[PDB]
Every structure is written in structure tokens, then in C-alpha cells.
Amino acid sequence: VLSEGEWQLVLHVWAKVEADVAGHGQDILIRLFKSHPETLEKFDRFKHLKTEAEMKASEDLKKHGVTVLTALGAILKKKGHHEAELKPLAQSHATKHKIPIKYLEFISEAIIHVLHSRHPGNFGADAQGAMNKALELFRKDIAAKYKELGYQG
Ligand code: HEM
Ligand SMILES: [Cl-]
């Protein structure tokens, strides 16, 4: 369970993300695909992209990044009260997309890397600690939902 103080560090850096969601979504998805190329294979819509340049030029990938970060933003703004938001996300990711928890760990790493790179004014050690705790909470609750849904994750 995060403290209010931890949530405020989380929401303070997220406020900067929100200056340019699309840009942050591109950086995060590209970082994920570069660091863990197996994750790209889960995306039938994107798995043809061969290079970072093709990824940067992909209008569709940018749209998807906005969709992803906006969903995560809405979860973070619930400050742990995210049962309603997690139900559809867990169901699609377990049953349609088949995304293991390991891959959620990978995108968590990508989010942290990008925030660390772009936002050193709002992402020092304590802020990164808080964001890690929020993402761990997200993954813990998603894992529990996966198990309820019948997906071992
Ligand atoms: C913070 C973690 C994540 C969030 C908030 C997130 C959010 C979303 C959202 C909102 C959608 C659109 C609606 C839906 O199908 O549920 C989506 C689609 C999808 N997600 Fe995620 N996602 C996350 C992590 C991942 C990861 C790590 C992968 C793969 C390694 C993944 C693979 C997909 C795929 C394949 C789709 C369908 C894309 C398409 O063809 O339209 N997700 N995700
Ligand atoms: Cl800090």
C-alpha cells in the first residue's frame, strides 16, 4: 500500500508525462521493443517494424502509446482504488493478448527508464521508488486477476 506522499511523487512526474503523452508513449514502447524484442512479437499490428526509425514514423504505434499511457494514467490517479479499471485490462491481456507478468515487468522497466531520462527534476531516487511501488502494486493486482481469469501469467 502506497502512502499519500508516495502517490504525490507518482502523480507529480505523471503530470510532466501528460505535457506530451504521445511522445512519452513512443519512447516507452520503443524502449520496451529494443530492450526486450520478444515483446514486439505479441503485437500482430506492429511486429513487422524492423528499426527504431520505422517505429518512430509509425502513426499507429504512436496512437497505441497514447492509449496505453492514458489507461495507465487513469489507474495511477485512482491511487490504488483501480479495481474497475483493472478488470477489462486484465481480461484482454490474459485472454486475448496473452501477456505474461514478466512482460509487464519489462514495460515497467521501460516506463522507469524513460521517466528517469526525461524527468530528472521529478524522478530522483525517492520519486523512482514511489513509481516502482505503484507499478509493483499494478502488477500484483493484475497477477491476482490473471489467476482469477484462469491465466497463469
Ligand atoms: C502498463 C502496462 C500496460 C497497459 C496499461 C496496457 C494497456 C493497453 C490498452 C489500453 C490496450 C487497448 C485495449 C485492450 O486491448 O485492453 C492494449 C492493447 C494491447 N496490449 Fe497492452 N498494456 C500494457 C502492457 C502490455 C504489454 C507489456 C504488452 C506486450 C508485451 C501488451 C500487449 C498489448 C497488445 C498486443 C494489445 C493489442 C494491440 C492492438 O493490436 O491493438 N500490453 N494495452
Ligand atoms: Cl525524488
Swiss-Prot record:
One GO CC term, this protein: sarcoplasm
EC class of the enzyme, as a word: oxidoreductase
Positions annotated to bind O2: H64
Pfam families xref list: Globin
InterPro entries linked: Globin, Globin-like_sf, Myoglobin
Residues at which nitrite binds: H64
Result after altering G121A: In metmyoglobin
Known catalytic reactions: Fe(III)-heme b-[protein] + nitric oxide + H2O = Fe(II)-heme b-[protein] + nitrite + 2 H(+); H2O2 + AH2 = A + 2 H2O
Keyword field contains Cytoplasm: yes
EC number: 1.7.-.-, 1.11.1.-
Coiled coil regions, renumbered to chain: none
Domain Globin stretches: 1-147
Residues with the Phosphothreonine modification: T67
Alphabetically ordered keywords of this record: Cytoplasm, Heme, Iron, Metal-binding, Muscle protein, Oxidoreductase, Oxygen transport, Phosphoprotein, Transport
Binding site for heme b: H93
Subunit structure: Monomeric.
Purpose of the protein: Monomeric heme protein which primary function is to store oxygen and facilitate its diffusion within muscle tissues. Reversibly binds oxygen through a pentacoordinated heme iron and enables its timely and efficient release as needed during periods of heightened demand. Depending on the oxidative conditions of tissues and cells, and in addition to its ability to bind oxygen, it also has a nitrite reductase activity whereby it regulates the production of bioactive nitric oxide.
Family under the similarity heading: Belongs to the globin family.
The protein's name in its UniProt record: Myoglobin
